[PDB]
Design an enzyme around this catalytic site. Structure first.
Site, short mmCIF file in Angstrom:
data_model
loop_
_atom_site.label_atom_id
_atom_site.label_comp_id
_atom_site.label_asym_id
_atom_site.label_seq_id
_atom_site.Cartn_x
_atom_site.Cartn_y
_atom_site.Cartn_z
N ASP A 83 -35.05 -39.33 18.39
CA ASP A 83 -35.38 -38.40 17.00
C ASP A 83 -34.59 -38.76 15.40
OD1 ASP A 83 -32.99 -36.72 17.11
OD2 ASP A 83 -34.23 -34.37 16.93
N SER A 142 -31.17 -37.11 15.29
CA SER A 142 -30.58 -36.08 15.43
C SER A 142 -29.40 -36.43 16.18
CB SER A 142 -31.14 -34.74 15.97
OG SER A 142 -31.59 -35.21 17.47
N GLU A 170 -22.28 -33.10 30.24
CA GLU A 170 -22.92 -33.28 28.84
C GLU A 170 -21.39 -33.95 27.85
OE1 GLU A 170 -25.57 -33.23 27.41
OE2 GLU A 170 -26.50 -31.08 28.30
N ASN A 195 -29.70 -39.49 19.57
CA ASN A 195 -30.96 -39.42 19.75
C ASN A 195 -32.12 -40.32 19.43
OD1 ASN A 195 -30.18 -37.08 21.25
ND2 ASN A 195 -29.81 -35.85 19.79
N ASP A 225 -30.82 -18.11 22.36
CA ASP A 225 -32.10 -18.61 21.52
C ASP A 225 -33.38 -18.16 21.89
OD1 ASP A 225 -32.79 -19.31 18.83
OD2 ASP A 225 -33.70 -20.52 20.37
N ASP A 246 -25.50 -35.25 18.94
CA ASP A 246 -25.17 -34.35 19.57
C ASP A 246 -23.28 -34.31 19.52
OD1 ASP A 246 -28.17 -32.95 21.33
OD2 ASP A 246 -27.48 -34.38 22.62
N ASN A 284 -26.71 -29.87 19.30
CA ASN A 284 -27.22 -31.24 18.60
C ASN A 284 -27.69 -31.23 17.02
OD1 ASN A 284 -29.84 -32.32 17.95
ND2 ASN A 284 -31.00 -32.40 19.73
CS CS Z 1 -28.35 -37.21 23.23
CS CS Z 2 -26.53 -35.41 24.98
#
Ligand code: CS
Ligand code: CS
Ligand code: CL
Ligand code: CL
Ligand code: CL
Ligand code: CL
Ligand code: CL
Ligand code: CL
Ligand code: CL
Ligand code: CL
Ligand code: CS
Ligand code: CS
Ligand code: CS
Ligand code: CS
Ligand code: CS
Length: 129
Positions: A48, A50, A35, A46, A101, A52, A59
């Site tokens: 979209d 958003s 990551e 991202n 989750d 991270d 996110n």
């Molecule tokens: Cs990402």
């Molecule tokens: Cs990522």
């Protein structure tokens, strides 16, 4: 902060992540490696809109507020900047909520594609834990 591999394993254990929801410490270190390459200040946008944040690339779509993710939630109740701290507490606390989750560590696509089913114990081999 860029953590060392054993350094991060130890911090994660300290914060109760070792075997959390049945996921061994190696799983958590492997996910952080892919990551963030262990860099607490990692950010990635991202498609979209958003973003991270942090060692586990949490996110803004669901988990933290950055003020620029329309229609998102903030289920960890934190500013996303808190996930970039040299102290990993906020990231670990949020990751505990994420992994609880429903889909376990599959919430992290990189864990699924690069860690899942591998010899994740290698990530903690040699560490004084
Ligand atoms: Cs990402
Ligand atoms: Cs990522
Ligand atoms: Cl280290
Ligand atoms: Cl490494
Ligand atoms: Cl392990
Ligand atoms: Cl927002
Ligand atoms: Cl919310
Ligand atoms: Cl905030
Ligand atoms: Cl820490
Ligand atoms: Cl699970
Ligand atoms: Cs990248
Ligand atoms: Cs990107
Ligand atoms: Cs929001
Ligand atoms: Cs909230
Ligand atoms: Cs919180």
């Amino acid at each position: 902060k860029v953590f060392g591999r054993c350094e991060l394993a130890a911090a994660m254990k300290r914060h109760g992540l070792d075997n959390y929801r049945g996921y061994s410490l190696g799983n958590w270190v492997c996910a952080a490696k892919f990551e963030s390459n262990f860099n607490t200040q990692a950010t990635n946008r991202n498609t979209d809109g958003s973003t991270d944040y942090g060692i586990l690339q949490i996110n803004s779509r669901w988990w933290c507020n950055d003020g620029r993710t329309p229609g998102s939630r903030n289920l960890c109740n934190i500013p996303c900047s808190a996930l970039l701290s040299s102290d990993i507490t906020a990231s670990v606390n949020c990751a505990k909520k994420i992994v609880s989750d429903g889909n376990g560590m599959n919430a992290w696509v990189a864990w699924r594609n690069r860690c899942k089913g591998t010899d994740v114990q290698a990530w903690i081999r040699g560490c004084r834990l």
